[PDB]
Amino acid sequence: GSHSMRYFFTSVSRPGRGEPRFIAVGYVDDTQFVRFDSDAASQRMEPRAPWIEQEGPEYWDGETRKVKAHSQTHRVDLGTLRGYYNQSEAGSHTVQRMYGCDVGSDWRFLRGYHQYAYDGKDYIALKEDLRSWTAADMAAQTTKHKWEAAHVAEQLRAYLEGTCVEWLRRYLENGKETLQRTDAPKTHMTHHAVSDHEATLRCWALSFYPAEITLTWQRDGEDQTQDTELVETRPAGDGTFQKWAAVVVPSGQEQRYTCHVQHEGLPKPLTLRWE
């Protein structure tokens, strides 16, 4: 039902090996649709989904212009942050920015977000009211004062509530066959002895979209969360996702264990059994 548009930006300094590397990517839900890489030959915002290709030359020129502007800002930010934290030129550092908007099943605005990290830790984030900031440390308080005096929140709020949601709706419509689909997981469990006395039970979900899924093991109905190995949801490469969860159990107890799968494509949650 619900949908998101998100843009992800990463800038990495490269001490004495030239200017920072900048990578930008845009997603609708779990489907990438655009990229920019400062190191690439094209110097253009590039399509990465079939349904964005129909956008006109004004779109591509304007997105290239804007993404290059973001690239330059983040270049400046890396120097600013070195100053704020009194850091040297010896080391590489990383700035990350994420922003975007969520809509409900009825495609009306739910929430907006606009967040920044420096060296993998939260730096500054727009609050859920889109009017105020959370600054994670003293350096980010300096940014907060500057952004408050410059009325940055008001500019972002108008984008996140208006433009962001309008373009997300357009993408959802244009990319309807890709984006407004739900592929339910194809599920099974595998069994393999690891010794004469223990077996690995692995619960699989394959070929699903969107990526959000829950897989859990129970023993006589009790959740086995501390004993479960759960891997990160991974892309198949074809637009669908995969995930597994495993437990190692004593041989003969298989029938006590059940796997439980929750996904929006399922008419009901599934319970998989060894009997």
């Binding site: 843009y7 845009g26 997105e63 804007k66 993404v67 502007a69 973001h70 330059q72 800002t73 400046v76 930010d77 600013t80 942050l81 700035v95 922003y99 920044y116 730096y123 500054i124 940014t143 500057k146 952004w147 410059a150 940055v152 500019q155 972002l156 984008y159 433009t163 962001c164 373009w167």
Partner: peptide, 9 residues
């Protein structure tokens, strides 16, 4: 569609 305004840290 990207945001079109710039803001420095």
């Amino acid at each position: 569609l990207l945001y079109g305004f710039v803001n420095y840290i």
